[PDB]
From a paper:
Uropathogenic [name] strains use filamentous type 1 pili to adhere to and invade uroepithelial cells. The pilus consists of a flexible tip fibrillum, formed by the adhesin FimH and the subunits FimG and FimF. The pilus rod is a helical assembly of up to 3000 copies of the main subunit [name], terminated by a single copy of the subunit [name] that anchors the rod to the assembly platform FimD in the outer membrane. The assembly platform FimD in the outer membrane of uropathogenic [name] is the catalyst of type 1 pilus assembly.
To explore the structural implications of [name]-mediated termination of pilus assembly, we performed a FimD-catalyzed assembly reaction of pilus rods in vitro similar to the one for the FimDHGFAnC complex, except that excess FimICHis was also added at the end of the reaction. A 3D reconstruction of the FimDHGFAnICHis complex at 6.4 Å resolution was generated (Map XIV). Initial reconstructions showed poor resolution of both the pilus rod and the assembly platform. However, multi-body refinement with blush regularization in RELION-5.033,34 improved the resolution to 4.0 Å for the pilus rod (map XV) and 4.3 Å for the [name]-bound assembly platform (map XVI). This refinement also enabled analysis of rod flexibility relative to the [name]-terminated assembly platform. The resulting composite model shows that the [name]-terminated pilus rod sits on top of the assembly platform at an angle of about 48°, similar to that observed for the FimDHGFAnC complex. Despite a greater degree of motion in the [name]-bound state, the observed modes of pilus rod motion and its conformation remained highly similar to those in the complex with a terminal [name] subunit.
Numbering used by the authors:
A (entry chain I), H (entry chain E): 2 to 158
B (entry chain J), C (entry chain G), E (entry chain H), F (entry chain F), G (entry chain D), I (entry chain C): 2 to 159
D (entry chain K): 4 to 158
J (entry chain B): 2 to 19
The structure:
């Protein structure tokens, strides 16, 4: 009997012609690095512990393509330290001289130019997972404050 | 002492005379479906898998309303297929011959006109989670691109 | 001395006027079904083994009620099969013609309508546990892929 | 080479110990929906929803206690603690308003002279919580309800 | 050689000059309190059973600080009872006169103003765990409905 | 009688067109290694004792495939030391200069390339067990801290 | 002196107002039924060997309770065979058409609804032990596979 | 021939710089205390049956540490009962005025503050075992319900 | 009356399409080797005292199969010593450079590969017992500490 | 002939340097 206006719902997605499709929980995600003490990141080039995330693939036809690579794109911190994500947050109250570093499964940072892909990983006829790591890289003295970073990823087959 | 002007806050809500109120996180949600391979939607009629989304009702009183139904309003791709939802991502770059469906409880396509209501669901004296599915529909050859859609929903109580 | 903002915490609960309050572990749970062979799920009517899961009720009262029943509100995969859930994991990657059936303690399928309750279970003072099962069901020829399903359940106290 | 677009920048360079985070300058609070049955009685109040105001780069050396006052449009002289609805569309809900609660669950006077209860500041990022709820001053009527309120911060 | 955009990733952290750092999974945790009966919460001041959570501190350095204490900050229900958090859910559907309150390791309510700290815990040279309890406190006659509470904690090393 | 909203249940599984399926208790399991002494892990290239965990295969058909193998995928700690798991714990308070090694039933480290499968194992009609080991390997001077590694296993049937 | 984090420990238990205390070794005891051949399980009514497992009760007094009975609650495999427990193992690789049947001291089966109770046993001041049996009862042609059957049990005193 | 994604496997452990290492079988465990009677736990200060358990320490060397002890940390009932671990099961259906408490080999209740340590025990050149008991202490008229508790123990050498 | 929740129980078993069924006590057996002296295992090849266990087969049918063979699958310590079980006690404080050997009826060490069966044993109608012996085996020099292993066995009937 | 799986075997013991 009684009817009222409920609301609005938006749906998002992408239709791709690649060999594999990215999962809904992997297209857009957020991860927690956690608090990191400044004492560990005292001098330049220091490194803290690494937290782990992953990107999920689905319906990977090995006949079309057998290997998958991922390359990141973001904002570098300085000319020398190209492989560090700068802290993209509010203008006020943001930590400086320290960034987020992305580690490929081989334990080395990936270039942020957008053309350096990860090591080739083989796929299977079904769901697939490619692992990555996120840690803190100190380019100098670490200052207290928040640290939020955003970076996109591109897949090559 | 050192008083500083800040910013502004906008409260948005709706007063209704019905038997239930839609949840605050439910009135406006962004359901993300991830990516779709073109091989899944290569031919017309092929349907990809679905992602479930649910609408939450609060303070439902069964003494005045026994069941509830939800109708969806949106822009169909064409009169030939009135049970899909055309893409509304941007002016350029959108995919072609693809659209999203809003399946009801019985796993069937809903009519996107605001008139055809879904299968009635009985309520209880409390939270009622009404579920739905969203899946991509192929009207031909699925070209690469994006796929975003918007659909309003109206809640009936009988 | 040193003071640092740590973060925030959230608590989720439900105050109900029923006879038994659902346990925290049973409020939100993730049943693991492992993997099932496409050879074992070949044609319509096929059924693999069932994984058991139970719902726990705490602080039951015998004076106010004596029996308990549950009802699941899920998404029927087909109009001809209203007792089978439909997989909803992502737009691509889920299995086709395969669903998950929820069996009550009487070894019978439950139709997902929100009104057809399960078999009654006698209650006792204190803690009470109600068992169930979940299994895979085949509506045709299976297709390799993932299978994630969600369903809310409604509990009555006669 | 083709033309792109236009990008605007907004913000304030304030001389304070704490600066408001970019996510709190202009934010939207989805109250949800409220049934008229729970608001039919005059003076009845519905349940609240929570929104937070975030302060960044706080210096505990010069500032210790912080508070927030709200400026808005009240419904009536008698009910000065309620905020009237400023919805652009006509046919909005009648005899209803929104109240911004305090840290101690008390209605805030919307005149700009009454501030929130003092909250101790912490080095780095300090968050102060608040709630928004529906206040019915009479017979509620179905319709939309959009309201706006500015906040001024005192240290 | 198909190269396609996959998506985006966000990272959240807080670099601080503190004796110990909070775990990534402990900076923002959700606690499922299950359900509680209106019969149990009927009487004024009735306190239900408490569910336990924990804050995990890592990389502790006993040289710079040996005792750690935290204080919680939230929205109190009323000035009479300042040690009870207020429910923060949609504008309609939440319970009344019932709120989540926090207990330290000494079984006492924590005043929610950001200035009253819990009992100080001695830190080791490694991982430490600070336990806490959350329980439902009734300021009067309870009402059936959901209860979603949020709170913020403030770490202090002394 | 009185009815209330009980809760939500999720079901997770995967259908595979293979010779053998993986047990529900084996698709996602947690292995405890316990504390290890930095005195024993001080020297570079040291090795501690192993903890036994096994992968269960069910409903194997010998006709489809007579031999089975499993390979591991994870983040190598260093390029030169490719056969060692890295640390996947929080970003603070985690032991460095150490990692986790996976040992095949032949007592050899398994390369984490994702294409280096372990030694083949015979299959029999019914439930099968594939054992493995996990141990600590030091790439230098051991440091105090926690350790939480993770590895994705892919099974081959032939 | 070199103090480090050790770990955690969990305590589980229940408090009842009855005249007996159920022992921890019987609250969550596990029984092994061994293996059986499909030759002995070919038609309706075919049985196997029955192993012996006991339920222990201590701290009992004869002043309040003199008789004790045990009622098993579990998932019946079929409506007709209400006294046969099903196979709640992993979703694949389990047996088909074979169930677990719980016996009594007299020799009759026990219904798994929970309302019916077994034969009453006399108690004594101190420690009491109630024996039971478990066997295999095939409802038809037997199939190879695992079988992990779970069932709760309640104790009566009158 | 056929490749199929199986799943994920986690690992958990610690690398501590100490004389002895807590065994993986004792880092975390669940010990059932059975059921108890309100008649037994009727009055304040009552005591139910004690269930025994042990903590195992592997790789113990005596040239760096001779005596070892453990300390427990948990939530007490009140200010007047600081050696009784409280109950943490859910928001309903739990017992009242009764809590789990821990006893060392001597038979004394360990304070749950985390500072007081157990009786010092000598270390042997090999696997060592420290026994403990858990029991129910009633601070009043006990009530029917469940009782779950968690405690955190730390080792001093 | 005064029914209370006693607890829950589990039953583990397996139905096999074979000529023999293993004993319930035999399927899960824990053999203990006792404390040994390092001087007895100081040099490579030295073995400690050998203890004896057995596997019991019930309901053996001579017509279906008149022979019985067993193969043991486990983790080998080294590629050169593939007949020695690796130790799976823990990740620290486990005796190093030693393993356990399972001698068959004739005394020959059994390879851990799944294709290496023991000597064929004549089958008698009804219950049979097949004996095996467990002993230590030290390579190089033995070291103090615990040494525990694990291995599953496949029974072949011919 | 037919090959089927058996149970699990666990070994326990300790080595002492006395």
């Amino acid at each position: 009997a009684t009817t009222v206006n409920g609301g609005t719902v938006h749906f998002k997605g992408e239709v791709v012609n690649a060999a594999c499709a990215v999962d809904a929980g992997s297209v857009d995600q957020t991860v927690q690095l956690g608090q990191v003490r400044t004492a560990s990141l005292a001098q330049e080039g220091a490194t803290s512990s690494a937290v782990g995330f992953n990107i999920q693939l689905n319906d990977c036809d090995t006949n079309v393509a057998s290997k998958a690579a991922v390359a990141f794109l973001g904002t570098a911190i300085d000319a020398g330290h190209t492989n560090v994500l700068a802290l993209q947050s509010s203008a006020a109250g943001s930590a400086t001289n320290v960034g987020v570093q992305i580690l490929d499964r081989t334990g080395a940072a990936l270039t942020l130019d957008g053309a350096t892909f990860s090591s080739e990983t083989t796929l299977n006829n079904g769901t697939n997972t490619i692992p990555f790591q996120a840690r803190y890289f100190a380019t100098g003295a670490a200052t207290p404050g928040a640290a939020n970073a955003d970076a996109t990823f591109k897949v090559q087959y």
